[PDB]
């Protein structure tokens, strides 16, 4: 099987560097080097993310889409930056304006064809394609607009292969941009209707989870990114490993989406202990479920405790008892019968790889489909209206060839999306 | 004389590798000896690959190892219809190529995992295409039906109410081994909170050895495969008996091993030892095939059973005077060199049809409704060449399986 | 407040059924349809009551046979009249693959077998042309589309190979962007478009849906001042794919929408079909369902499933108001 990553925008891009920083080491691939793999198993399934050309050069099969040179020229001028074949860099030296409209209708719409071109060169690579990984932020141009287009096109070209989306939904407390809800509401819209698996991460849900669950005092972006990339590795790549009970994107999809919206999840990693001290090793297993299922530790902003779950997928990856795994999951399902929805006898989807995260003994990625994420699109949707009402920075959109009915559309859509999700919380 | 076997679904393949292990182990045929007599099907390469990479690597022909690099999908539909279809031909071909090479066979011991994609769906049509190509044989499918509370897949029931209805009108005798109810045995009758799948497999890998292996093997009271279905199914519904083993004692902890027949047989009817969460909560047995192996005196049996026939609290069906098929083999069991199985010199792999499953099916049917009641993951099948028909019409199916297993009992 | 009208129609045996020596398990008497289960002959037969029951299992020589003209003059004229009153209307055919949905909606453009759509169009123009009040003028616009795997194709514009985008107008509801809407001034012109549209469909189990829309505008001219008050009614005639993925999203979603409405959030947006027909299902529209039924024993489950969805549809109720 296979997949082809997609680094839309700067963020989605910045993260690319971290997702590939990791993944590679979790596959023994040095900058341009080959497979130094401490083992021999980190190779029989690599294909999922690379391509064979030389014999020591397995190049990441991702796409780097962005209308701001400097960015990709920071990712390509640093560490692992020199492993991507230049063909991968689909830049847009234009003005990468922070407008969803500027990267979806006017500026991005041009650079698109020169992207799809490659997304096809990579898809028609070899063997059988599974789906595409998509990273980006719903709070900017090259991210929400242009990346949200990249998919609307992808999903017309292969409505068969899957589409996981890793979105950095606009954090609450403080917005790292101003129109944010504009660029956001507009991209979520496109998401709820193309990709079929979305993993929403919040820069501040991370800080928290990174400053209190990792006594880490100076959580640089690199970190946040790093933590995130840690989860997306547990998801995909991982399951493309052996296991007593293994799954793969689809299983994950076909066990997690009760209703076609596409629904968005909230990823959570397992061993998340501070370096030295904490290295408690309390990782027998009840310790991992202890972790994963708590409020804090959910990369999302919202707290599960604020709304039932529809599905859950503990994708563990480290030798354990299909008994102490299958078992724990249960008590968990009974101690919290309250929030776990009922019309699904077994919400949880236990998954079990074998080999764990390179240096760790036992981990377990969590992919939750809780109704709690209602209280986020609400947020976003609110911010919109409060500012849409006055058409705040709307001239930067319309003036870019947009529509007063376009914004209406998205909000509503994504706004209805909130509605539905409640239809199950009840 | 023989009995081919088709291990379908990752699980049916893991269990397969296991049951297949125990085999050579008690036949003195190391890694590289003769030639198996089965096949392996899966729509996820990486798993059958485990049989291609791991142990018992060269004991198979890359011809009896079928794979569909494509996608597994934990959904019946896709595995049965859409994808699973493409492979079937090829699959069949082997069970027609392997079915020819032999000499007057008896049937195909099928190994699948009820609630899976490749295991539920696919087989559904595999057994389907068999019942027509060899209606004149035995179709005993050995299943691992849905843990009563510890299921895995979110949809499981969708996949198991569908493998039951499609296979029902095609199997001869469906053996059932409950994944969870086997754990209990690993906790309560062997002690270990560290049971790897690789163990449950060693277990069924045992109970199964008692079925084919040893039985098709000479003895003081041989029992052919046909024998089963005959002495085991009272009615055409591909009736599903339950597998049970007796000396499930730990090869470390306790040691009373020397547990004469009189004991090991009583240890079969206590509900805490039956590889199935179908505790005889009321289910009246209606036929049991006590397969013994090792040093056993026919009188010991034709007495140990007599004592039972008169315990009454073990209430057998009405319309059934005597429902005890005593199968005696010679060669004692054969435990893994150093797993965790005791290793006695006699065992009792008793299987049976019990009005008990009236439960197990019930509890699994109900599940289904809850979700169907909201269509839950329905769009996943529809979009895979299925319809509101196949679901609703396979629900009605089992409905008359809840009435069937009710009527054939509880009444006189 | 107007409930969804529901009719059931049983057709003659098809080749498949005759070949299996199928027996008829459907019985009709008055507004009651009873289905016998061939599997469990001694179980009590299930009975259903509907607004209309069309026994079309035999032939026109039969006195109790329901012909094309009779089905139309019944439910068809009823809906057409509602359109003249100013209400939006919808008639959709539902049922198992091959049960007779297309025969009922389109029929054959030959001697005596025209379905509801051609007859309604002919009736619509005949009525408009018999108008004797010169203060009344009319306009008729038509659109014809196909929904296949959630994609929309314009049947009156085959030149185009792009699938049209289904959108939500911020104030006016769902619509197909760039879908052809042609004005027609005669039954012959609209029938040519219908014929042209039918030929460009795909292309033998259908898994596409066809939606034929008519925008009927009535203009009343008031003599004294010169304002012209408009009266607009949208007539949607739907021929659904049969019931037995992206290929089946619409049909399954419709089932859920129908169940939800009968139960009274609704997943209208879960599919293009339920999205576009949102107002006809639970909105301001006089709607009718024509459930096509196979008469054969071999199709018991499918037929029973259809009778049950038609039974729920009967329970749907919609708030209607005239568009004046
Ligand atoms: C001596 C020793 O055992 O060191 C550990 C360690 O101290 C701890 C604290 C690690 C450490 O992780 C962090 O401090 C961290 C920093 C930024 C963001 C997130 C986490 C570690 O850096 C991370 C590193 O993780 C791995 O090696 C995994 O394979 C992981 N790899 C990466 O994230 C990675 C990092 C740099 C370069 C390339 C990859 C992984 C996890 C999931 C999927 C794929 C890969 C491990 C076990 C450790 C150190 C090295 C200190 C922990 O994290 C992980 C992801 O394992 C933090 O809590 C856990 C518990 C570990 O015990
Ligand atoms: N006893 C036993 N049960 C197993 C084993 N592997 C899986 N199972 C059980 O069988 C079911 C899992 O089926 P899956 O592995 O998801 O799927 P599959 O049937 O192989 O086919 P796909 O869904 O297409 O992958 C669960 O109920 C597991 O508990 C095994 O090795 N032994
Ligand atoms: N009342 C009827 N009288 C005579 N023939 C009929 C009647 N109803 C249906 N048929 C015929 O039976 C078949 C079913 O036709 P249609 O072709 O009407 O099915 P659907 O439209 O039911 N099929 P599908 O679109 O594939 O899901 C056709 O051959 C029709 O001509
Ligand atoms: N986790 C994370 N968030 C980022 C990174 N870079 C920008 N962001 C977030 O992305 C949003 C800004 O969008 P940006 O990526 O600049 O848009 P674009 O570059 O125009 O497509 C803010 O909410 C930031 O917190 C990053 O490297 N990691
Ligand atoms: Mg599998
Ligand atoms: Mg038709």
């Amino acid at each position: 099987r296979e997949i082809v990553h997609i680094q839309a925008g700067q963020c989605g891009n910045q993260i690319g560097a971290k997702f590939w920083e990791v993944i590679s080491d979790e596959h023994g691939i040095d900058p341009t080097g080959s497979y130094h793999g401490d083992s021999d198993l980190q190779l029989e399934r690599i294909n999922v993310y690379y391509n064979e050309a030389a014999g020591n050069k397995y190049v990441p099969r991702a796409i780097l889409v962005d209308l701001e040179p400097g960015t990709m020229d920071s990712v390509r001028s640093g560490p692992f930056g020199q492993i991507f074949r230049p063909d991968n860099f689909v830049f847009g030296q234009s003005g990468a304006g922070n407008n969803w409209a500027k990267g979806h209708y006017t500026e991005g719409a041009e650079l698109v064809d020169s992207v799809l071109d490659v997304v096809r060169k990579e898809s028609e690579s070899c063997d059988c394609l599974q789906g595409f990984q998509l990273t980006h932020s719903l709070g900017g141009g090259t991210g929400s607009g242009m990346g949200t287009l990249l998919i609307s096109k992808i999903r017309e070209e292969y409505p068969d292969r899957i589409m996981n989306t890793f979105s950095v939904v606009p954090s609450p407390k403080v917005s790292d941009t101003v129109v944010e809800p504009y660029n956001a509401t507009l991209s979520v819209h496109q998401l709820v209707e193309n990709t079929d698996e979305t993993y929403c991460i919040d820069n501040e849900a991370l800080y928290d989870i990174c400053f209190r669950t990792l006594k880490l005092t100076t959580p640089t972006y690199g970190d946040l990114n790093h933590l995130v990339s840690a989860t997306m590795s547990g998801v995909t790549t991982c399951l493309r490993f052996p296991g007593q009970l293994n799954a793969d994107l689809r299983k994950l999809a076909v066990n997690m989406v009760p209703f076609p919206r596409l629904h968005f999840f909230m990823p959570g990693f397992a061993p998340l202990t501070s370096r030295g001290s904490q290295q408690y090793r309390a990782l027998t297993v009840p310790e991992l479920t202890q972790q994963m299922f708590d409020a804090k530790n959910m990369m999302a902003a919202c707290d599960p405790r604020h709304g039932r779950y529809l599905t859950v997928a503990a994708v563990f990856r480290g030798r354990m008892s299909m008994k102490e795994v299958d078992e724990q999951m249960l008590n968990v399902q009974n101690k919290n019968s309250s929030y776990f929805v009922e019309w699904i006898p077994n919400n949880v989807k236990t998954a079990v790889c074998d080999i764990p995260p390179r240096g760790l003994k036992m981990s377990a990625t969590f992919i939750g489909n809780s109704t709690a994420i209602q209280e986020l699109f609400k947020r976003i949707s609110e911010q919109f209206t409060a500012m849409f009402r006055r058409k705040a920075f709307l001239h930067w959109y319309t003036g870019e060839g947009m529509d007063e009915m376009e914004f209406t559309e998205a909000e509503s859509n994504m706004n209805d999306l909130v509605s539905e999700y409640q239809q199950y919380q009840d | 004389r023989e009995c081919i076997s088709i291990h379908v679904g990752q699980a049916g393949v893991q269990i397969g590798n296991a049951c297949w292990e125990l085999y050579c182990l008690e036949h003195g045929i190391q890694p590289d000896g003769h030639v198996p007599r089965a096949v392996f099907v899966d729509l996820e390469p990486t798993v059958i690959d485990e049989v291609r990479t791991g142990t018992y690597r060269q004991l198979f022909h890359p011809e009896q190892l079928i794979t569909g690099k494509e996608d597994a999908a934990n959904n019946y539909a896709r595995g049965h219809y859409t994808i699973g279809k493409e492979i079937i031909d090829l699959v069949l071909d082997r069970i027609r190529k392997l079915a020819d090479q032999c000499t007057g066979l008896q049937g195909f011991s099928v190994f699948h995992s009820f609630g899976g994609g490749t295991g539920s769906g696919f087989t559904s049509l595999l057994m389907e295409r068999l019942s027509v190509d060899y209606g004149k044989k035995s179709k005993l499918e050995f299943s691992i039906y849905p843990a009563p509370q510890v299921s895995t897949a979110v949809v499981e029931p969708y996949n198991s109410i569908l493998t039951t209805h499609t296979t029902l009108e095609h199997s001869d005798c469906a053996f059932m081994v409950d994944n969870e109810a086997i754990y209990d045995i690993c906790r309560r009758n062997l002690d270990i909170e560290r049971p790897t799948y690789t163990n449950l497999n060693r277990l069924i890998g045992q109970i199964v050895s008692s079925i084919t292996a040893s039985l098709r093997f000479d003895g003081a009271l041989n029992v052919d495969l046909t024998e089963f279905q005959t002495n085991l199914v009272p009615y055409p519904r591909a009736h599903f008996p339950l597998a049970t083993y007796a000396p499930v004692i730990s090869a470390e902890k306790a040691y009373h091993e020397q547990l004469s027949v009189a004991e090991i047989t009583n240890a079969c009817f206590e509900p805490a030892n039956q590889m199935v969460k179908c505790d005889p909560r009321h289910g009246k047995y209606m036929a049991c095939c006590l397969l013994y192996r090792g040093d056993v005196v026919p009188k010991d049996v034709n007495a140990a059973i007599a004592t039972i026939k008169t315990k009454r609290t073990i209430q057998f069906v009405d319309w059934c005077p005597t429902g005890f098929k005593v199968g005696i083999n010679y060669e004692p069991p054969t435990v893994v060199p150093g797993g965790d199985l005791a290793k006695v010199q006699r065992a009792v792999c008793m299987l049976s049809n019990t009005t008990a499953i009236a439960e197990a099916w019930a509890r699994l049917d109900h599940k289904f409704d809850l979700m169907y009641a909201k269509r839950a993951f329905v769009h996943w099948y529809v979009g895979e060449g299925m319809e509101e028909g196949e679901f609703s019409e396979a629900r009605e199916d089992m409905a008359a399986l809840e009435k069937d297993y009710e009527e054939v009992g509880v009444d006189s | 407040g107007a409930s969804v009208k529901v009719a059931v129609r049983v057709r003659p045996f098809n080749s498949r059924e005759m070949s299996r020596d199928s027996k008829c398990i459907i019985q009709m008497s008055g507004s009651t349809t009873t289905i016998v289960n061939p599997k469990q002959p001694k179980e009590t037969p299930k009975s259903f009551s509907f607004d209309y029951s069309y026994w079309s299992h035999t032939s026109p020589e039969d006195i109790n046979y329901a012909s094309q003209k009779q089905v139309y003059r019944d439910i068809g004229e009823e809906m057409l009249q509602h359109a003249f009153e100013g209400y939006n209307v919808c008639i959709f055919a539902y049922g198992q693959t091959g049960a007779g949905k297309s025969y009922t909606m389109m029929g054959k453009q030959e001697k005596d077998q025209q379905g509801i759509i051609p007859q309604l169009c002919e009736d619509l123009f005949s009525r408009i042309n018999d108008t004797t009040n010169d203060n009344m003028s009319y306009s008729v616009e038509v659109s014809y589309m196909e929904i296949y795997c959630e994609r929309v194709r314009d049947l009156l514009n085959p030149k185009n190979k792009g699938n049209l985008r289904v959108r939500e107008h911020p104030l006016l509801g769902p619509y197909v962007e760039d879908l052809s809407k042609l004005a027609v001034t005669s039954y012959n012109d609209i029938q040519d478009l219908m014929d042209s549209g039918n030929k460009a469909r795909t292309v033998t189990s259908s898994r596409s849906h066809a939606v034929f829309n008519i925008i009927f505008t009535q203009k009343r001219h008031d003599a004294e001042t010169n304002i012209t008050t408009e009266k607009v009614s949208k007539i949607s005639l739907v021929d659904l794919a049969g019931s037995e993925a992206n290929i089946n999203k619409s049909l399954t979603t419709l089932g859920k929408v129908i169940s939800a409405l009968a139960e009274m959030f609704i997943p209208y947006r879960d599919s293009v079909l339920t999205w576009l027909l949102r107002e006809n299902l639970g909105g301001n529209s006089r709607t009718a369902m024509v459930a096509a039924l196979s008469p054969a024993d071999i199709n018991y489950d499918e037929t029973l499933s259809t009778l049950r969805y038609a039974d729920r549809a009967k329970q749907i109720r919609n708030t209607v108001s005239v568009n004046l």
Side-chain angles (χ1 to χ4, degrees), chain C residues 41-60:
Chain C
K42 290 157 168 171
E43 229 136 71
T44 322
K46 302 178 190 296
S47 294
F48 300 79
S49 313
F50 297 109
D51 294 297
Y52 317 104
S53 311
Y54 300 126
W55 175 252
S56 304
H57 180 56
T58 52
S59 81

mmCIF file of all heavy atoms in Angstrom, chain C residues 41-60:
data_model
loop_
_atom_site.group_PDB
_atom_site.id
_atom_site.type_symbol
_atom_site.label_atom_id
_atom_site.label_comp_id
_atom_site.label_asym_id
_atom_site.label_seq_id
_atom_site.Cartn_x
_atom_site.Cartn_y
_atom_site.Cartn_z
ATOM 1 N N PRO C 41 -44.708 -19.454 4.631
ATOM 2 C CA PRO C 41 -46.097 -19.494 4.161
ATOM 3 C C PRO C 41 -47.183 -19.491 5.231
ATOM 4 O O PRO C 41 -48.265 -18.949 5.015
ATOM 5 C CB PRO C 41 -46.136 -20.766 3.322
ATOM 6 C CG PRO C 41 -44.765 -20.834 2.764
ATOM 7 C CD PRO C 41 -43.914 -20.500 3.963
ATOM 8 N N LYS C 42 -46.905 -20.097 6.380
ATOM 9 C CA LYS C 42 -47.898 -20.168 7.445
ATOM 10 C C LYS C 42 -47.822 -19.038 8.471
ATOM 11 O O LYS C 42 -48.539 -19.049 9.472
ATOM 12 C CB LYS C 42 -47.808 -21.525 8.144
ATOM 13 C CG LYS C 42 -48.297 -22.693 7.297
ATOM 14 C CD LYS C 42 -47.669 -23.973 7.799
ATOM 15 C CE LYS C 42 -48.300 -25.210 7.208
ATOM 16 N NZ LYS C 42 -47.483 -26.395 7.591
ATOM 17 N N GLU C 43 -46.948 -18.071 8.222
ATOM 18 C CA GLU C 43 -46.820 -16.919 9.102
ATOM 19 C C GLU C 43 -47.903 -15.970 8.579
ATOM 20 O O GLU C 43 -48.315 -16.096 7.431
ATOM 21 C CB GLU C 43 -45.415 -16.311 8.983
ATOM 22 C CG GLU C 43 -44.768 -16.082 10.361
ATOM 23 C CD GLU C 43 -43.304 -16.518 10.418
ATOM 24 O OE1 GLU C 43 -42.510 -15.799 9.781
ATOM 25 O OE2 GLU C 43 -42.940 -17.533 11.057
ATOM 26 N N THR C 44 -48.387 -15.044 9.401
ATOM 27 C CA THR C 44 -49.441 -14.132 8.946
ATOM 28 C C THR C 44 -48.934 -13.143 7.892
ATOM 29 O O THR C 44 -47.914 -12.503 8.081
ATOM 30 C CB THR C 44 -50.034 -13.319 10.124
ATOM 31 O OG1 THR C 44 -50.126 -14.151 11.286
ATOM 32 C CG2 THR C 44 -51.426 -12.820 9.775
ATOM 33 N N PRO C 45 -49.638 -13.015 6.757
ATOM 34 C CA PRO C 45 -49.235 -12.091 5.689
ATOM 35 C C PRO C 45 -49.252 -10.651 6.181
ATOM 36 O O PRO C 45 -50.142 -10.263 6.936
ATOM 37 C CB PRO C 45 -50.286 -12.330 4.609
ATOM 38 C CG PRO C 45 -50.680 -13.758 4.828
ATOM 39 C CD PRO C 45 -50.774 -13.845 6.332
ATOM 40 N N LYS C 46 -48.283 -9.852 5.755
ATOM 41 C CA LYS C 46 -48.227 -8.465 6.189
ATOM 42 C C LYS C 46 -49.042 -7.554 5.284
ATOM 43 O O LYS C 46 -48.960 -7.640 4.057
ATOM 44 C CB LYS C 46 -46.773 -8.008 6.260
ATOM 45 C CG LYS C 46 -45.967 -8.878 7.205
ATOM 46 C CD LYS C 46 -44.513 -8.483 7.262
ATOM 47 C CE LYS C 46 -43.712 -9.523 8.031
ATOM 48 N NZ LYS C 46 -44.130 -9.615 9.460
ATOM 49 N N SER C 47 -49.838 -6.689 5.906
ATOM 50 C CA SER C 47 -50.700 -5.763 5.181
ATOM 51 C C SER C 47 -50.323 -4.312 5.393
ATOM 52 O O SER C 47 -49.941 -3.903 6.496
ATOM 53 C CB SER C 47 -52.156 -5.966 5.602
ATOM 54 O OG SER C 47 -52.629 -7.236 5.194
ATOM 55 N N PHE C 48 -50.448 -3.525 4.332
ATOM 56 C CA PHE C 48 -50.129 -2.114 4.396
ATOM 57 C C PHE C 48 -51.245 -1.325 3.739
ATOM 58 O O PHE C 48 -51.894 -1.809 2.816
ATOM 59 C CB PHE C 48 -48.811 -1.849 3.675
ATOM 60 C CG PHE C 48 -47.645 -2.584 4.264
ATOM 61 C CD1 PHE C 48 -47.443 -3.929 3.982
ATOM 62 C CD2 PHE C 48 -46.757 -1.935 5.110
ATOM 63 C CE1 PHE C 48 -46.369 -4.622 4.535
ATOM 64 C CE2 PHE C 48 -45.678 -2.617 5.668
ATOM 65 C CZ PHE C 48 -45.483 -3.958 5.380
ATOM 66 N N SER C 49 -51.473 -0.115 4.227
ATOM 67 C CA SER C 49 -52.514 0.745 3.691
ATOM 68 C C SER C 49 -51.848 1.960 3.072
ATOM 69 O O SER C 49 -50.949 2.557 3.662
ATOM 70 C CB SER C 49 -53.457 1.185 4.813
ATOM 71 O OG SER C 49 -53.835 0.071 5.603
ATOM 72 N N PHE C 50 -52.286 2.333 1.873
ATOM 73 C CA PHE C 50 -51.700 3.478 1.194
ATOM 74 C C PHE C 50 -52.754 4.351 0.540
ATOM 75 O O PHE C 50 -53.907 3.944 0.397
ATOM 76 C CB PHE C 50 -50.708 3.001 0.135
ATOM 77 C CG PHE C 50 -49.547 2.246 0.696
ATOM 78 C CD1 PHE C 50 -49.438 0.878 0.501
ATOM 79 C CD2 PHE C 50 -48.558 2.902 1.413
ATOM 80 C CE1 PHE C 50 -48.359 0.167 1.015
ATOM 81 C CE2 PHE C 50 -47.473 2.201 1.932
ATOM 82 C CZ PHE C 50 -47.372 0.833 1.729
ATOM 83 N N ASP C 51 -52.347 5.549 0.144
ATOM 84 C CA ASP C 51 -53.243 6.485 -0.508
ATOM 85 C C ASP C 51 -53.681 5.924 -1.853
ATOM 86 O O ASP C 51 -54.850 6.031 -2.226
ATOM 87 C CB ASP C 51 -52.545 7.829 -0.710
ATOM 88 C CG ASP C 51 -52.234 8.528 0.599
ATOM 89 O OD1 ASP C 51 -53.192 8.871 1.327
ATOM 90 O OD2 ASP C 51 -51.036 8.734 0.899
ATOM 91 N N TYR C 52 -52.745 5.314 -2.573
ATOM 92 C CA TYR C 52 -53.041 4.745 -3.885
ATOM 93 C C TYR C 52 -52.431 3.356 -4.024
ATOM 94 O O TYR C 52 -51.315 3.106 -3.569
ATOM 95 C CB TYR C 52 -52.484 5.642 -4.987
ATOM 96 C CG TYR C 52 -52.716 7.115 -4.771
ATOM 97 C CD1 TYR C 52 -51.680 7.938 -4.339
ATOM 98 C CD2 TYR C 52 -53.968 7.686 -4.980
ATOM 99 C CE1 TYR C 52 -51.881 9.292 -4.117
ATOM 100 C CE2 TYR C 52 -54.181 9.041 -4.764
ATOM 101 C CZ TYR C 52 -53.131 9.837 -4.331
ATOM 102 O OH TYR C 52 -53.325 11.176 -4.089
ATOM 103 N N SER C 53 -53.169 2.456 -4.659
ATOM 104 C CA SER C 53 -52.709 1.092 -4.875
ATOM 105 C C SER C 53 -52.944 0.749 -6.337
ATOM 106 O O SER C 53 -54.082 0.586 -6.774
ATOM 107 C CB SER C 53 -53.492 0.138 -3.987
ATOM 108 O OG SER C 53 -53.511 0.636 -2.662
ATOM 109 N N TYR C 54 -51.861 0.645 -7.095
ATOM 110 C CA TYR C 54 -51.975 0.347 -8.512
ATOM 111 C C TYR C 54 -51.636 -1.091 -8.856
ATOM 112 O O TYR C 54 -50.484 -1.504 -8.806
ATOM 113 C CB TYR C 54 -51.092 1.311 -9.307
ATOM 114 C CG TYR C 54 -51.475 2.756 -9.109
ATOM 115 C CD1 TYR C 54 -50.535 3.703 -8.710
ATOM 116 C CD2 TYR C 54 -52.791 3.181 -9.315
ATOM 117 C CE1 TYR C 54 -50.890 5.036 -8.516
ATOM 118 C CE2 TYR C 54 -53.157 4.511 -9.125
ATOM 119 C CZ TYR C 54 -52.206 5.432 -8.726
ATOM 120 O OH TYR C 54 -52.565 6.749 -8.540
ATOM 121 N N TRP C 55 -52.663 -1.861 -9.189
ATOM 122 C CA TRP C 55 -52.488 -3.252 -9.567
ATOM 123 C C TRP C 55 -52.194 -3.283 -11.070
ATOM 124 O O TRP C 55 -53.113 -3.185 -11.889
ATOM 125 C CB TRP C 55 -53.764 -4.031 -9.242
ATOM 126 C CG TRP C 55 -53.772 -5.458 -9.693
ATOM 127 C CD1 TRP C 55 -54.492 -5.983 -10.730
ATOM 128 C CD2 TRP C 55 -53.048 -6.553 -9.118
ATOM 129 N NE1 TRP C 55 -54.265 -7.332 -10.832
ATOM 130 C CE2 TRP C 55 -53.382 -7.712 -9.851
ATOM 131 C CE3 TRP C 55 -52.150 -6.669 -8.044
ATOM 132 C CZ2 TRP C 55 -52.849 -8.972 -9.556
ATOM 133 C CZ3 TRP C 55 -51.619 -7.920 -7.749
ATOM 134 C CH2 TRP C 55 -51.971 -9.056 -8.499
ATOM 135 N N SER C 56 -50.918 -3.398 -11.423
ATOM 136 C CA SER C 56 -50.500 -3.424 -12.826
ATOM 137 C C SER C 56 -49.751 -4.704 -13.119
ATOM 138 O O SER C 56 -48.847 -4.725 -13.948
ATOM 139 C CB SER C 56 -49.604 -2.223 -13.129
ATOM 140 O OG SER C 56 -50.252 -1.007 -12.810
ATOM 141 N N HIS C 57 -50.137 -5.774 -12.440
ATOM 142 C CA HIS C 57 -49.486 -7.066 -12.589
ATOM 143 C C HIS C 57 -49.951 -7.868 -13.805
ATOM 144 O O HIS C 57 -49.207 -8.700 -14.333
ATOM 145 C CB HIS C 57 -49.696 -7.885 -11.308
ATOM 146 C CG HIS C 57 -49.064 -9.243 -11.338
ATOM 147 N ND1 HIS C 57 -47.722 -9.433 -11.580
ATOM 148 C CD2 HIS C 57 -49.584 -10.473 -11.129
ATOM 149 C CE1 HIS C 57 -47.443 -10.719 -11.517
ATOM 150 N NE2 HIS C 57 -48.555 -11.375 -11.243
ATOM 151 N N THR C 58 -51.177 -7.609 -14.253
ATOM 152 C CA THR C 58 -51.735 -8.328 -15.394
ATOM 153 C C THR C 58 -51.557 -7.571 -16.717
ATOM 154 O O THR C 58 -50.440 -7.469 -17.235
ATOM 155 C CB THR C 58 -53.224 -8.630 -15.150
ATOM 156 O OG1 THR C 58 -53.906 -7.424 -14.799
ATOM 157 C CG2 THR C 58 -53.379 -9.630 -14.023
ATOM 158 N N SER C 59 -52.647 -7.052 -17.271
ATOM 159 C CA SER C 59 -52.568 -6.289 -18.519
ATOM 160 C C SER C 59 -53.826 -5.441 -18.693
ATOM 161 O O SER C 59 -54.803 -5.604 -17.964
ATOM 162 C CB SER C 59 -52.425 -7.235 -19.718
ATOM 163 O OG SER C 59 -53.686 -7.760 -20.085
ATOM 164 N N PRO C 60 -53.822 -4.529 -19.678
ATOM 165 C CA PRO C 60 -54.968 -3.657 -19.943
ATOM 166 C C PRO C 60 -56.297 -4.354 -20.254
ATOM 167 O O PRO C 60 -57.342 -3.731 -20.151
ATOM 168 C CB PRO C 60 -54.483 -2.793 -21.102
ATOM 169 C CG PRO C 60 -53.003 -2.704 -20.846
ATOM 170 C CD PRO C 60 -52.659 -4.122 -20.489
#
